[PDB]
Short mmCIF file of C-alpha atoms in Angstrom, two decimals:
data_model
loop_
_atom_site.label_atom_id
_atom_site.label_comp_id
_atom_site.label_asym_id
_atom_site.label_seq_id
_atom_site.Cartn_x
_atom_site.Cartn_y
_atom_site.Cartn_z
CA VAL A 1 28.25 24.73 3.13
CA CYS A 2 24.57 24.76 2.11
CA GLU A 3 21.76 25.77 4.47
CA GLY A 4 20.84 22.93 6.78
CA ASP A 5 24.31 21.38 6.72
CA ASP A 6 26.90 21.54 9.52
CA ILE A 7 29.79 24.00 9.88
CA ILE A 8 32.79 22.15 11.25
CA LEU A 9 35.57 24.22 12.76
CA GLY A 10 38.69 23.25 14.60
CA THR A 11 42.43 23.47 14.84
CA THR A 12 45.29 21.03 14.85
CA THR A 13 47.76 22.82 17.09
CA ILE A 14 48.68 22.37 20.75
CA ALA A 15 48.14 25.08 23.29
CA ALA A 16 47.26 25.94 26.85
CA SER A 17 44.12 27.73 25.71
CA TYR A 18 42.17 28.30 22.52
CA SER A 19 39.85 31.19 21.70
CA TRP A 20 37.35 31.22 18.86
CA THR A 21 34.95 33.96 17.84
CA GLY A 22 32.54 34.39 14.96
CA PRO A 23 29.20 35.40 13.41
CA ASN A 24 25.85 35.09 15.13
CA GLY A 25 27.31 34.90 18.64
CA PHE A 26 29.74 32.06 18.00
CA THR A 27 32.43 31.47 20.59
CA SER A 28 34.52 28.56 21.89
CA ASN A 29 37.61 27.68 23.92
CA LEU A 30 38.26 24.23 22.42
CA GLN A 31 40.46 22.76 19.73
CA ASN A 32 37.31 21.40 18.23
CA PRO A 33 34.26 23.59 18.92
CA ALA A 34 30.88 22.00 18.74
CA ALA A 35 29.54 21.90 15.22
CA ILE A 36 27.14 24.61 14.20
CA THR A 37 24.30 22.41 13.13
CA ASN A 38 21.46 23.28 10.83
CA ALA A 39 23.56 26.16 9.54
CA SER A 40 21.76 29.22 8.23
CA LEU A 41 22.75 32.17 6.06
CA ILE A 42 23.08 34.18 9.29
CA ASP A 43 25.99 31.90 10.29
CA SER A 44 28.03 32.85 7.27
CA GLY A 45 31.02 35.07 7.78
CA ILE A 46 34.52 35.09 9.24
CA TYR A 47 35.44 32.73 12.05
CA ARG A 48 38.64 33.57 13.90
CA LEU A 49 41.12 31.84 16.14
CA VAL A 50 43.80 33.01 18.60
CA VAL A 51 45.94 30.53 20.53
CA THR A 52 47.68 30.93 23.92
CA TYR A 53 50.76 28.93 24.82
CA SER A 54 51.89 27.68 28.23
CA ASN A 55 54.79 30.12 28.14
CA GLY A 56 52.35 33.06 28.12
CA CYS A 57 52.83 33.91 24.47
CA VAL A 58 49.84 34.53 22.21
CA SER A 59 49.72 33.67 18.51
CA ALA A 60 48.43 35.81 15.69
CA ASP A 61 44.75 35.73 14.83
CA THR A 62 43.95 33.65 11.78
CA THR A 63 40.74 33.19 9.85
CA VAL A 64 38.37 30.75 8.22
CA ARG A 65 35.73 32.26 5.87
CA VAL A 66 32.53 30.16 5.74
CA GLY A 67 30.05 30.78 2.98
CA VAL A 68 26.54 29.43 3.22
CA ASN A 69 24.55 28.67 0.09
CA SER A 70 20.82 28.93 -0.27
CA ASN A 71 18.81 25.93 -1.32
CA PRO A 72 16.62 26.19 -4.42
CA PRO A 73 13.01 27.29 -3.76
CA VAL A 74 10.61 24.51 -2.97
CA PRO A 75 9.12 23.52 -6.34
CA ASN A 76 5.44 22.87 -6.97
CA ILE A 77 4.93 19.67 -9.01
CA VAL A 78 1.96 19.49 -11.36
CA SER A 79 0.81 16.29 -13.10
CA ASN A 80 -1.57 15.60 -15.99
CA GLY A 81 -4.31 14.48 -13.65
CA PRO A 82 -6.17 11.15 -13.90
CA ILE A 83 -4.50 9.97 -17.10
CA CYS A 84 -5.72 6.78 -18.87
CA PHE A 85 -3.31 3.90 -19.07
CA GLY A 86 -1.29 4.05 -22.24
CA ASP A 87 -1.00 7.83 -22.43
CA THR A 88 2.18 9.67 -21.72
CA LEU A 89 2.64 10.76 -18.11
CA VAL A 90 4.07 14.21 -17.68
CA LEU A 91 5.27 15.70 -14.43
CA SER A 92 6.52 19.26 -14.39
CA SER A 93 7.18 22.37 -12.36
CA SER A 94 7.47 26.10 -12.98
CA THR A 95 10.47 26.39 -10.67
CA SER A 96 13.74 26.75 -12.51
CA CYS A 97 16.11 23.96 -11.37
CA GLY A 98 19.45 22.89 -12.86
CA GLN A 99 18.75 19.20 -12.61
CA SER A 100 15.68 17.40 -11.47
CA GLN A 101 15.67 14.04 -9.80
CA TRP A 102 12.28 12.40 -9.73
CA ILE A 103 11.36 10.02 -6.98
CA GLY A 104 8.69 7.52 -7.82
CA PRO A 105 7.71 4.26 -6.13
CA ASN A 106 11.08 2.82 -7.26
CA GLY A 107 13.18 5.85 -6.29
CA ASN A 108 15.85 7.04 -3.96
CA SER A 109 18.64 4.63 -4.88
CA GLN A 110 21.56 4.44 -7.34
CA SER A 111 20.10 1.45 -9.18
CA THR A 112 17.09 3.56 -10.21
CA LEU A 113 18.35 7.13 -10.34
CA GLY A 114 21.06 6.51 -12.87
CA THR A 115 23.32 9.01 -14.65
CA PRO A 116 21.42 12.26 -15.53
CA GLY A 117 20.41 13.27 -19.02
CA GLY A 118 19.65 11.13 -22.03
CA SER A 119 16.85 8.58 -21.86
CA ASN A 120 16.52 8.76 -18.08
CA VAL A 121 13.02 9.74 -17.06
CA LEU A 122 13.95 9.95 -13.39
CA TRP A 123 16.94 12.23 -13.63
CA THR A 124 16.54 15.01 -16.11
CA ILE A 125 18.38 18.20 -16.88
CA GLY A 126 15.34 20.45 -16.35
CA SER A 127 12.00 20.47 -14.51
CA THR A 128 9.83 18.49 -17.02
CA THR A 129 9.84 14.70 -17.37
CA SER A 130 7.83 12.47 -19.69
CA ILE A 131 7.23 8.81 -18.83
CA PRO A 132 5.98 6.59 -21.73
CA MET A 133 3.71 3.63 -21.07
CA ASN A 134 6.56 1.28 -21.96
CA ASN A 135 8.61 2.31 -18.97
CA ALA A 136 9.33 0.61 -15.68
CA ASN A 137 8.53 3.82 -13.81
CA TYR A 138 5.09 4.44 -15.37
CA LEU A 139 3.46 4.02 -12.01
CA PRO A 140 0.63 5.57 -9.97
CA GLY A 141 1.30 6.72 -6.44
CA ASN A 142 3.19 9.39 -4.53
CA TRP A 143 5.80 11.24 -6.55
CA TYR A 144 8.16 13.98 -5.51
CA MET A 145 11.01 15.92 -7.06
CA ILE A 146 14.41 17.01 -5.85
CA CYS A 147 15.88 20.21 -7.38
CA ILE A 148 19.60 20.02 -7.78
CA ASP A 149 21.74 23.11 -8.04
CA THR A 150 24.48 22.18 -10.49
CA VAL A 151 26.73 25.02 -9.35
CA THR A 152 26.64 24.65 -5.56
CA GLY A 153 25.45 21.07 -5.01
CA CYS A 154 22.37 22.22 -2.95
CA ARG A 155 19.12 20.24 -2.94
CA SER A 156 15.50 21.20 -2.34
CA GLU A 157 12.52 18.91 -2.12
CA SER A 158 9.15 19.38 -3.67
CA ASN A 159 5.60 18.86 -2.77
CA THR A 160 3.99 15.51 -3.07
CA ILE A 161 1.52 14.51 -5.76
CA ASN A 162 -0.70 11.47 -6.11
CA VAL A 163 -0.51 10.30 -9.69
CA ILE A 164 -3.56 8.39 -10.84
CA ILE A 165 -3.42 6.12 -13.86
CA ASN A 166 -6.79 4.67 -14.83
CA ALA A 167 -7.39 1.28 -16.40
CA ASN A 168 -8.96 0.87 -19.81
CA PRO A 169 -11.97 -1.49 -19.48
CA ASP A 170 -11.80 -4.89 -21.21
CA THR A 171 -13.22 -5.43 -24.66
CA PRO A 172 -16.84 -6.13 -23.67
CA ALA A 173 -18.65 -9.24 -24.74
CA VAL A 174 -21.86 -8.71 -26.63
CA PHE A 175 -24.62 -11.29 -26.91
CA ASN A 176 -27.97 -11.36 -28.69
CA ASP A 177 -31.22 -13.34 -28.94
CA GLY A 178 -30.10 -15.54 -31.80
CA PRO A 179 -31.61 -15.87 -35.24
CA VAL A 180 -34.55 -13.57 -35.92
CA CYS A 181 -37.03 -13.70 -38.84
CA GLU A 182 -36.86 -10.97 -41.46
CA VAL B 1 13.35 45.30 9.31
CA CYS B 2 9.79 43.92 9.15
CA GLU B 3 8.20 41.91 11.97
CA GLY B 4 9.34 38.32 11.90
CA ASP B 5 12.70 39.11 10.29
CA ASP B 6 16.09 39.15 12.05
CA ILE B 7 17.92 42.15 13.52
CA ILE B 8 21.62 41.77 12.83
CA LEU B 9 23.99 43.86 14.88
CA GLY B 10 27.74 43.89 15.10
CA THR B 11 30.91 45.89 14.86
CA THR B 12 34.06 45.72 12.80
CA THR B 13 36.60 47.08 15.26
CA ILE B 14 39.16 45.39 17.48
CA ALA B 15 39.03 45.65 21.22
CA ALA B 16 39.64 43.95 24.53
CA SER B 17 35.96 44.10 25.37
CA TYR B 18 32.70 45.10 23.72
CA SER B 19 29.51 46.26 25.41
CA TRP B 20 26.11 46.42 23.72
CA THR B 21 22.80 47.55 25.18
CA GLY B 22 19.35 48.05 23.73
CA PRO B 23 15.55 47.79 23.78
CA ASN B 24 13.61 44.93 25.34
CA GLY B 25 16.49 43.78 27.55
CA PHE B 26 19.09 43.44 24.82
CA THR B 27 22.71 43.13 25.90
CA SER B 28 25.94 41.58 24.60
CA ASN B 29 29.71 41.57 25.02
CA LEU B 30 30.63 40.33 21.52
CA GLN B 31 31.70 41.86 18.25
CA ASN B 32 28.80 40.05 16.72
CA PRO B 33 25.89 39.59 19.15
CA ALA B 34 23.45 36.83 18.48
CA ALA B 35 20.77 37.86 16.05
CA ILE B 36 17.47 38.96 17.47
CA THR B 37 15.28 36.52 15.66
CA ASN B 38 11.59 36.81 14.99
CA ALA B 39 11.89 40.53 15.65
CA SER B 40 8.85 42.33 17.01
CA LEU B 41 7.80 45.97 17.25
CA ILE B 42 8.92 45.85 20.90
CA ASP B 43 12.51 45.32 19.66
CA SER B 44 12.55 48.58 17.78
CA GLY B 45 14.62 51.40 19.18
CA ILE B 46 18.21 52.50 19.73
CA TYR B 47 20.96 49.94 20.06
CA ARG B 48 24.23 51.24 21.48
CA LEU B 49 27.86 50.22 21.59
CA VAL B 50 30.85 51.16 23.75
CA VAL B 51 34.28 49.61 23.19
CA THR B 52 37.15 49.06 25.66
CA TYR B 53 40.75 48.85 24.52
CA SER B 54 43.62 46.85 25.99
CA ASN B 55 45.27 50.07 27.11
CA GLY B 56 42.31 50.81 29.44
CA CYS B 57 40.80 53.51 27.26
CA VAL B 58 37.09 53.52 26.48
CA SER B 59 35.57 54.76 23.23
CA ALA B 60 32.56 56.98 22.80
CA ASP B 61 29.12 55.44 22.68
CA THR B 62 27.70 55.17 19.18
CA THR B 63 24.27 54.16 17.96
CA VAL B 64 22.29 52.10 15.50
CA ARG B 65 18.55 52.94 15.20
CA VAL B 66 16.45 49.90 14.19
CA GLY B 67 12.93 50.44 12.97
CA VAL B 68 10.52 47.55 12.77
CA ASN B 69 7.67 47.59 10.28
CA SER B 70 4.30 45.99 10.77
CA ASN B 71 3.06 43.44 8.30
CA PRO B 72 -0.27 44.06 6.55
CA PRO B 73 -3.33 42.57 8.32
CA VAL B 74 -4.13 39.01 7.40
CA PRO B 75 -6.61 39.28 4.51
CA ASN B 76 -9.77 37.23 4.17
CA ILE B 77 -10.15 35.84 0.62
CA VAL B 78 -13.64 35.36 -0.75
CA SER B 79 -14.42 33.47 -3.99
CA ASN B 80 -17.52 33.24 -6.19
CA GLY B 81 -18.41 29.84 -4.81
CA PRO B 82 -19.06 26.73 -6.93
CA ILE B 83 -18.76 28.44 -10.31
CA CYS B 84 -19.61 26.54 -13.55
CA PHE B 85 -16.81 25.95 -15.98
CA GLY B 86 -16.60 28.74 -18.50
CA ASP B 87 -17.59 31.55 -16.15
CA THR B 88 -15.17 34.11 -14.90
CA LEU B 89 -13.48 33.24 -11.61
CA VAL B 90 -13.14 36.12 -9.21
CA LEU B 91 -11.11 36.09 -6.03
CA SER B 92 -11.13 39.15 -3.81
CA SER B 93 -10.61 40.57 -0.36
CA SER B 94 -11.78 43.57 1.64
CA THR B 95 -8.32 44.16 3.06
CA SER B 96 -6.52 47.07 1.46
CA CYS B 97 -3.16 45.83 0.07
CA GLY B 98 -0.72 47.62 -2.24
CA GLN B 99 -0.07 44.61 -4.41
CA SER B 100 -1.57 41.20 -4.31
CA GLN B 101 0.20 38.06 -5.34
CA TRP B 102 -2.10 35.12 -5.86
CA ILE B 103 -0.90 31.62 -5.31
CA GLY B 104 -2.76 28.95 -7.18
CA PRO B 105 -1.82 25.35 -7.97
CA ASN B 106 0.93 26.72 -10.27
CA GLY B 107 2.21 29.39 -7.86
CA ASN B 108 5.14 30.40 -5.77
CA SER B 109 7.79 30.70 -8.48
CA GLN B 110 9.17 33.36 -10.85
CA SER B 111 8.03 31.50 -13.95
CA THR B 112 4.40 31.89 -12.84
CA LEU B 113 4.31 35.04 -10.74
CA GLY B 114 5.62 37.34 -13.42
CA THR B 115 5.94 41.13 -13.39
CA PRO B 116 2.97 42.80 -11.58
CA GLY B 117 0.23 44.74 -13.30
CA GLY B 118 -1.12 44.43 -16.80
CA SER B 119 -2.61 41.14 -17.96
CA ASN B 120 -1.23 39.15 -15.03
CA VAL B 121 -4.00 37.46 -13.10
CA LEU B 122 -1.62 36.21 -10.42
CA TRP B 123 0.08 39.46 -9.53
CA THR B 124 -2.22 42.40 -9.42
CA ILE B 125 -2.01 45.93 -8.14
CA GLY B 126 -5.00 45.59 -5.79
CA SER B 127 -6.96 42.91 -3.92
CA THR B 128 -9.32 41.71 -6.74
CA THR B 129 -8.31 39.32 -9.54
CA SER B 130 -10.37 37.93 -12.40
CA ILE B 131 -9.37 34.70 -14.13
CA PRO B 132 -11.05 34.02 -17.54
CA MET B 133 -11.74 30.47 -18.68
CA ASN B 134 -9.05 30.83 -21.33
CA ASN B 135 -6.29 31.07 -18.78
CA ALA B 136 -3.68 28.61 -17.62
CA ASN B 137 -4.47 29.41 -14.00
CA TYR B 138 -8.25 28.83 -14.20
CA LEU B 139 -7.97 25.96 -11.78
CA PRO B 140 -9.88 24.49 -8.82
CA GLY B 141 -8.07 23.82 -5.58
CA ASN B 142 -6.44 25.64 -2.70
CA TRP B 143 -5.73 29.30 -3.33
CA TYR B 144 -4.12 31.88 -1.11
CA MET B 145 -3.04 35.48 -1.37
CA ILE B 146 0.04 37.39 -0.28
CA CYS B 147 -0.41 41.12 0.52
CA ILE B 148 2.59 43.14 -0.47
CA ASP B 149 3.31 46.50 1.08
CA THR B 150 4.79 48.57 -1.74
CA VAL B 151 6.32 51.09 0.64
CA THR B 152 8.07 48.85 3.17
CA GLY B 153 8.42 45.51 1.36
CA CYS B 154 6.43 43.62 4.09
CA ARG B 155 4.31 40.56 3.28
CA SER B 156 1.26 39.01 4.90
CA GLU B 157 -0.44 35.78 3.99
CA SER B 158 -4.10 35.12 3.68
CA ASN B 159 -6.51 32.44 4.53
CA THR B 160 -6.98 29.47 2.33
CA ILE B 161 -9.96 28.87 0.08
CA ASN B 162 -11.05 25.82 -1.88
CA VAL B 163 -12.16 26.97 -5.29
CA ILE B 164 -14.65 24.65 -6.94
CA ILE B 165 -15.21 24.73 -10.68
CA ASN B 166 -18.03 22.47 -11.84
CA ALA B 167 -18.21 20.66 -15.15
CA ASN B 168 -20.95 21.31 -17.68
CA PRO B 169 -22.60 17.95 -18.55
CA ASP B 170 -22.20 16.62 -22.11
CA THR B 171 -24.79 17.27 -24.77
CA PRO B 172 -27.17 14.39 -23.97
CA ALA B 173 -28.22 11.87 -26.55
CA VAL B 174 -31.92 11.51 -27.09
CA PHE B 175 -33.58 8.45 -28.59
CA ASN B 176 -37.16 7.56 -29.43
CA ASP B 177 -39.40 4.64 -30.44
CA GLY B 178 -39.08 5.20 -34.16
CA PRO B 179 -41.81 5.94 -36.66
CA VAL B 180 -45.28 6.31 -35.17
CA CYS B 181 -48.65 6.42 -37.01
CA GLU B 182 -50.52 9.70 -37.12
#
C-alpha cells in the first residue's frame, strides 16, 4: 500500500474466535478487523492470525506481510512569470518524478489527461512541460502538478502557482493634423 | 531519536503474555506497543520488558535505553532589506547552527540543495549565505532556513522572510527643443 491508503485485513474461515496481532499496536478479534486508515510507514510489518475452533482446537499462526511505500516529495513548481501572450509557457520543478501530470483549468479528467508521453503537454515523462500558444491548455490561472512514481504507483501533489499571461495591446491608431506647408 | 520523532519499541519473541514499562507512564502488554509519537525529552529513559511463557515461567527483565535529542533553537533570519538588483543578497542569523540549508523559491529538493560546502549558496556550513546576482537562486520571495545539527542529525526551522529585490529603472530617453540660436 502507499502512505495515506488503507490496509485491509481479514480472513475467510469460520471459527469460534479469531485473534489478530500486528505492528504499531494492532489487534483484533474479528474475521474482518477495522481497516487501518491513513496508513503510515510505521504500520508496515507482519500481521498475524490465529484461529480458535468450537471444539477447543487452535490453528497454526499464519502471516500477511504489508509493505508501505513512501510518496514522492512534494514538488515545488516554478513558472516563467508574467509571460506575454504568444510566448511559450514553461512549468517545471527541481524534484525528480517519474511522470508528471499537470492540472490546469481543464484538468483532472481522462478526456484531458490523455496517455502520457508524446505531444501531451499535460502528462509528461519528467518534471518540465512546455505549452505553445497554439494549445488548448495555454491558459492563465491556478496550476498544480502530480508526481507519479512509475514503480510503486504512488502520487504526490505540488504547490499551487498562479500563471499570468499578459495581453499584447492592439495595433494603435495614429492620427495627425492633416496637410502641412513645407 | 530527536524530539518530534517516534519511539518504536517491540520484541521478536513468542510468549503467552508480554509486559512493558517505562518513562512518563509508558506501559504495554503487546509484542509491538503503539509507537510513542511526537516524542519529547520527558520520554527519554529506560524502557523494560518481561515475558511470560505458557508454562508459567517468567523471563528476566531486559532493557532498551532511549535517548532523545533536542532540536536546535528556532533561528531568526535577517536579510539586507530592499536590495537593488545587482547587489549581493545576504541572508544570515545569529543562531549558531552546524549547517544551514536555505530554502528559496527553488528549494526543498535534491536537485537544488546539493552537497554542502563549497560554492553552494543554499547549503552552507554556517548561518550566513551570500547570493551573487549571477546566481540561479538570486530571487525575491519567501525564504526560510533549516538548522542542521551535524552531531545528532536534528533539524530546526526558521522564521520566514520576504526578500525584496528592486529593479533598476531603464536608461531614460532625453529629448530637447532642437537647434537654438546662440
